[PDB]
Amino acid sequence: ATIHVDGKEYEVNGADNLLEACLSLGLDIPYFCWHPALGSVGACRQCAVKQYQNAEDTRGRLVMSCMTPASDGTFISIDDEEAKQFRESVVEWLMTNHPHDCPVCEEGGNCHLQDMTVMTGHSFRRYRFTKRTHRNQDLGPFISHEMNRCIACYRCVRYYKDYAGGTDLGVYGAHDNVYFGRPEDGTLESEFSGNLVEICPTGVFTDKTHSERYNRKWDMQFAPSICQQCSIGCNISPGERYGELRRIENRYNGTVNHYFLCDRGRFGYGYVNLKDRPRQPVQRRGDDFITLNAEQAMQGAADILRQSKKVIGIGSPRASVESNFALRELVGEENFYTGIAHGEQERLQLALKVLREGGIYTPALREIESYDAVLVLGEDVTQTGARVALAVRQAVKGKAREMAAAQKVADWQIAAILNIGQRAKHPLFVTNVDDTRLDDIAAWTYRAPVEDQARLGFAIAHALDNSAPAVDGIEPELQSKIDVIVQALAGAKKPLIISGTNAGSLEVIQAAANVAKALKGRGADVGITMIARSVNSMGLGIMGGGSLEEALTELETGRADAVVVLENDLHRHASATRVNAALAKAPLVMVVDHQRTAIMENAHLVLSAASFAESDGTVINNEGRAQRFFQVYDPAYYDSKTVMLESWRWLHSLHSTLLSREVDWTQLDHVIDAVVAKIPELAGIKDAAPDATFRIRGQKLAREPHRYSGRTAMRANISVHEPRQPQDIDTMFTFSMEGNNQPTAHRSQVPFAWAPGWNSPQAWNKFQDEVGGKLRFGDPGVRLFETSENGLDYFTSVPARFQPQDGKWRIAPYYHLFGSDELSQRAPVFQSRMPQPYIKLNPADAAKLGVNAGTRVSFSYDGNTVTLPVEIAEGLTAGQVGLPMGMSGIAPVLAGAHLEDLKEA
């Protein structure tokens, strides 16, 4: 369409809002209640402009930019007298009752209300009466809440109810005494409550974890990185101050993770600033530990490796592609073992085969929301990686969206869409062992063991296409439910099949592939996605290697006398006693890691590897795209004794000193050249971010804002003589303020969102070609996969029905969000949020055991009789006991494993 703003012609979209069309042109209209991902309401009246119909008009009408469609022939005006003074009156009405507590506010220089108060140009106060005050609420360990700062813009409840689907927060109040929160005091049980810090334009909902050890936004040294907590790989902006990581911000990327993070990735950054982390190369000699620098530690490690006869490199899914390849080059290629179990590696390889050889397009996180039906097989999506679950919520709301669009109403007014919808949902069929958080909006939920979920998928694939292998023994009511599922999926334009390796069985992945092939064979636009376990598990599968059990057999047999374990706990992927015995039998154990694990004891050398806040690396998504994360700070800037070098740097220098007896501190793009010249499947990772010699208009990119404070007194407590800024040869980023963070810069990766006059998280709209859409000049990361021309075959192996037995108990995975990751559970803030280690029993199983809820029972695994209190689960089945995977002492390998001796303690 063609509009005229300020007596000037512009060409904008026709079906979008006028506010987003004007913001996509770079013009400045203040707003409080409109969000690009939440639609438009009238909770404020801040976006007021003056509209004229004809080309020439005198009076016009004061309209809202977020309520006016950007149609052909509108002549609106922004900086006239009346609209500007009306917006000044609206910000005056917002400052009518606002507390005078800006310097003691967690927003401060990150506050949208300050930016829009300054932008409207209101400084003189004419209000002389009393203000409005409210009490406070305890909203858990993550969201600090205080109601005085609010302006009643209704964005929090709009996100939390319509978008996030949470059933906790809401509006309780009246004309002026309007309250936003919880009817009681308690933790917000939604997994997306951490996005309220950036959704709220005021300091009502703030980061409690950042409130403790707080610094302002301009003091934050930011970096563009990837969240390492699970496989969704949401683009994040970690920001540090005084040598510790302080705040993770949402980093905009229009392909994956546009506006919202999950709670785990938002609040699981407390492990990188732990005080028990390995910060020095520590080698134990005799019975006491000595501390070395990098040089003599590398020399000694290379001498012991030269004196050894065979080296085993045990990688990890938590490590980067560059670090795992550096290990793969340090040890021989024929002996390099992936740090996962045999069943886990089989599930990962089958998932990769489905991804890159099934011939079915795998959707990204943004385009999951555009699909017409969702079938989730055996995956706790809301608890493993919750961003796909949020996208599934949006895809469910897509039916109400399209039904509203059929009534010729606009798509940016979410109130009319939810008016027309009225609990009209796309078909969502979730299968899990127990109840999920998606059951509120699901068309159907199937509570069954993993084999029964796989058989349900096989029945769905057989009903969709007769070429699939048939499964017998289906009950007529279950057959009717299969008929309902397949007539919902056959009538869907773009069906979606979601699975994962966290189900604990190959047959669920096989059933998901069979259903996707059956949907593709009849001409549907089916997509399939698999949620992997760790952040770079799929990259480890692409690179490949032996399983952990093969390496343990090699260590126990004695064929290798030297083992190098890279960033792996080794207890989550195998049994603890066998791993401890194999590592004790090895004459040389080197552990390259950044976290104090249980294998550092009786380990001959410990290399202080760098975490994602202190290292550069490449991680591969669950979708299949390869993104890369950058360093946030130099660990040697403060406490210069520590080195904390990158894992790939450590292993490559070890390899170079093994060969030529010389230490080489190489560069990251050399390792990228190595991985694209050695592995043809990883040849595409040199397209996510460019070379380190990439300078737009001659200069680098800044980690920190232009108002970085205290540069001559930050390190003055130990030395007044200011040290040189840390020179970064690995990346295209300088560690200090003299870079470039201009929104109109030809780049794909942005450290942080800051524009002149836009100091809020709502400053990301200046970095996009259209606001709420894709990022300008492309998106970070490249796909690395193509849809295959010819798919796989139908998987004939249909599993049998799960028949319970009295002596043997089947372990059912649960995967709690705040407790199914080692890196998450090492954070001190998750301990008050994570539930206590429990076990789950059927009512019939609890009756046959004679125990009640809350009573300790003892179960024996690996010769250890460990005791846990029970919980009665209605959705669980007989013969199964439920366990939270990833716990302390409960490895995720046990998912699908058997259990014995369920006796009361």
Partner 1 sequence: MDYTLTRIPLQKQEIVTDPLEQNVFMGKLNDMVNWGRKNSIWPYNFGLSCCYVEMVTSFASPRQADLMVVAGTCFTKMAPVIQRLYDQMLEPKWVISMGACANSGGMYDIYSVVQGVDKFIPVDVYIPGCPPRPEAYMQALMLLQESIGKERRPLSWVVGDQGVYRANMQSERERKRGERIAVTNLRTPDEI
Partner 2 sequence: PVYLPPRYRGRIVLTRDPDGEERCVACNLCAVACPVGCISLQKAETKDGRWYPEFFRINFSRCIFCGLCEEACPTTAIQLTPDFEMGEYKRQDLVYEKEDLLISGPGKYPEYNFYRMAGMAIDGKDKGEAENEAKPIDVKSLLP
Partner 3 sequence: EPAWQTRDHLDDPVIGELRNRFGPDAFTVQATRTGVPVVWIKREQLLEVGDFLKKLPKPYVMLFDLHGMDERLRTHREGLPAADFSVFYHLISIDRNRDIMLKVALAENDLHVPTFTKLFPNANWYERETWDLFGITFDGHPNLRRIMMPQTWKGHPLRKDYPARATEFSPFELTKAKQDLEMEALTFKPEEWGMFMFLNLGGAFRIVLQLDGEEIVDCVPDIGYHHRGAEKMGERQSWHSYIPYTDRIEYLGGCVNEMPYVLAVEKLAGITVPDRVNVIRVMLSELFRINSHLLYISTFIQDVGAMTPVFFAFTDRQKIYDLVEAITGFRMHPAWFRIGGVAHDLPRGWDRLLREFLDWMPKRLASYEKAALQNTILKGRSQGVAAYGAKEALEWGTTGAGLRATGIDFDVRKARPYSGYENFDFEIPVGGGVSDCYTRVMLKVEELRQSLRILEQCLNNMPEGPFKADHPLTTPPPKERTLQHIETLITHFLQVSWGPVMPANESFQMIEATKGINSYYLTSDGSTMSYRTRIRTPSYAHLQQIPAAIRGSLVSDLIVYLGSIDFVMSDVDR
Q: Which does 660 bind (CB under 5 to 8 A by kind): ligand SF4, Ca ion, partner 2, none?
A: none
Tokens of residue 760, six digits: 């809020």
Give 355-400 as a DSSP string: HHHS--PPP-TTTTTT-SEEEEES--HHHH-HHHHHHHHHHHHHHH
- Considering only 90, 111, 340, 404, the residue that binds ligand SF4 (CB under 6 A) is 111
- Considering only 54, 59, 124, 276, the residue that binds partner 3 (CB under 8 A) is 124
By CB under 6 A, residue 500 contacts ligand SF4 = no
Q: Which does 239 bind (CB under 5 to 8 A by kind): partner 3, ligand SF4, partner 2, none?
A: none
Number of CB atoms found within 10 A of residue 5's CB: 22
DSSP-assigned beta bridge partners for residue 432? 447
Q: Who contacts 619 (Cβ-Cβ below 8 Å, separation ≥6)?
A: 226, 228, 233, 320, 321, 535, 536, 539, 626, 627, 628, 629
Classify residue 238 as left (phi > 0), alpha (psi -120 to 50) or beta.
Answer: beta
Q: Which does 59 bind (CB under 5 to 8 A by kind): ligand SF4, ligand FES, partner 3, none?
A: none
- Considering only 717, 719, 720, 806, the residue that binds partner 1 (CB under 8 A) is 720
By CB under 8 A, residue 114 contacts partner 3 = yes
Query: Degrees (nearest 5) of the Cα angle 594, 596, 600?
Result: 105
By CB under 8 A, residue 769 contacts partner 2 = no
8 A C-beta contact, residue 85 and residue 97: no
By CB under 6 A, residue 442 contacts ligand SF4 = no
- Considering only 8, 59, 126, 135, the residue that binds partner 2 (CB under 8 A) is 135
Place of tokens 């707080």: 214
Q: Which is nearer to partner 3, 113 or 784 (CB)?
A: 113
Distance CA 567, CA 494 (A): 40
Site string for ligand SF4, 137-176 (x = CB under 6 A): ------------xxxxxxxx--------------------
Burial 567-583 (b: 16+ CB within 10 A, else e): bbbbbbbbbbebbbebb
By CB under 6 A, residue 31 contacts ligand FES = yes
Tokens of residue 743, six digits: 């929104």
By CB under 8 A, residue 521 contacts partner 2 = no
Q: How far is the CB of 136 from partner 2 (least distance, A)?
A: 7
By CB under 6 A, residue 819 contacts ligand SF4 = no
By CB under 8 A, residue 95 contacts partner 3 = yes
- Considering only 57, 722, 786, 904, the residue that binds partner 1 (CB under 8 A) is 722
8 A C-beta contact, residue 832 and residue 141: yes
Q: How far is the CB of 730 from partner 1 (least distance, A)?
A: 25
Q: How far is the CB of 70 from ligand FES (least distance, A)?
A: 13
Q: How far is the CB of 527 from partner 2 (least distance, A)?
A: 45
The closest alpha carbon to 300, from 320, 313, 285, belongs to 285
Distance CA 247, CA 538 (A): 27
How many residues interact with ligand FES (rule CB under 6 A)? Answer: 14
Distance CA 238, CA 247 (A): 6
- Considering only 114, 537, 765, 842, the residue that binds ligand SF4 (CB under 6 A) is 114
Footprint (CB under 8 A) of partner 2, residues 260-289: none
How many residues interact with partner 3 (rule CB under 8 A)? Answer: 39
C-alpha dihedral, 391 to 395 to 396 to 402, nearest 10°: 150
Stretch that binds partner 3, among 122-130, 402-410, 458-466, 854-862 (CB under 8 A): 122-130
Distance CA 371, CA 401 (A): 12
Q: Which does 114 bind (CB under 5 to 8 A by kind): Ca ion, ligand SF4, partner 1, none?
A: ligand SF4
Number of CB atoms found within 10 A of residue 203's CB: 24
Residue 509's alpha-carbon distances to 278, 345, 388, in angstroms, are 38, 13, 17
By CB under 6 A, residue 204 contacts ligand SF4 = yes
Distance CA 295, CA 33 (A): 57
- Considering only 308, 370, 553, 740, the residue that binds partner 3 (CB under 8 A) is 740
Site string for partner 2, 679-708 (x = CB under 8 A): ----------------------------xx
Place of tokens 């024996």: 860
Sheet holding 205-207, edge to edge: 138-139, 143-145, 205-207
Give 402-450 as a DSSP string: HHHHHTT--SS-HHHHHHHHSS----EEEEESS--TTTTT-SEEEE--H
Site string for ligand FES, 48-87 (x = CB under 6 A): ----------------xxx---------------------
Tokens of residue 504, six digits: 């604990």
By CB under 8 A, residue 721 contacts partner 1 = yes
By CB under 8 A, residue 133 contacts partner 2 = yes
Footprint (CB under 8 A) of partner 2, residues 173-192: 173-174, 177, 179
- Considering only 695, 774, 783, 833, the residue that binds partner 3 (CB under 8 A) is 695
Site string for ligand SF4, 247-286 (x = CB under 6 A): --------------xx-xx---------------------
Q: Which is nearer to ligand FES, 42 or 875 (CB)?
A: 42
Q: Who contacts 674 (Cβ-Cβ below 8 Å, separation ≥6)?
A: 325, 329
Q: How far is the CB of 573 from ligand SF4 (least distance, A)?
A: 19
8 A C-beta contact, residue 585 and residue 355: no
By CB under 6 A, residue 795 contacts ligand FES = no
By CB under 8 A, residue 148 contacts partner 2 = yes
Q: Which does 124 bind (CB under 5 to 8 A by kind): ligand SF4, partner 3, partner 1, none?
A: partner 3
8 A C-beta contact, residue 481 and residue 511: no
- Considering only 103, 523, 807, 850, the residue that binds partner 2 (CB under 8 A) is 103
Q: How far is the CB of 225 from Ca ion (least distance, A)?
A: 12
- Considering only 31, 180, 252, 361, the residue that binds ligand SF4 (CB under 6 A) is 180
Site string for partner 2, 208-237 (x = CB under 8 A): ---xxxxxx-xx------------------
Give 493-530 as a DSSP string: SSEEEEEEGGGS-HHHHHHHHHHHHHHHHTT---EEEE
Q: How far is the CB of 219 from partner 1 (least distance, A)?
A: 17
Distance CA 604, CA 585 (A): 12
Stretch that binds ligand SF4, among 121-129, 215-223, 227-235, 850-858 (CB under 6 A): 227-235
Strands 373-377 and 495-500 turn out to be: parallel
Provide the binding-site residues for partner 3, judged by CB under 8 A. 92, 95, 98-100, 102-103, 108-109, 113-115, 117-119, 121-125, 216, 218, 695, 697-699, 706-707, 724-725, 734, 736, 738, 740, 742, 744, 756-757, 759
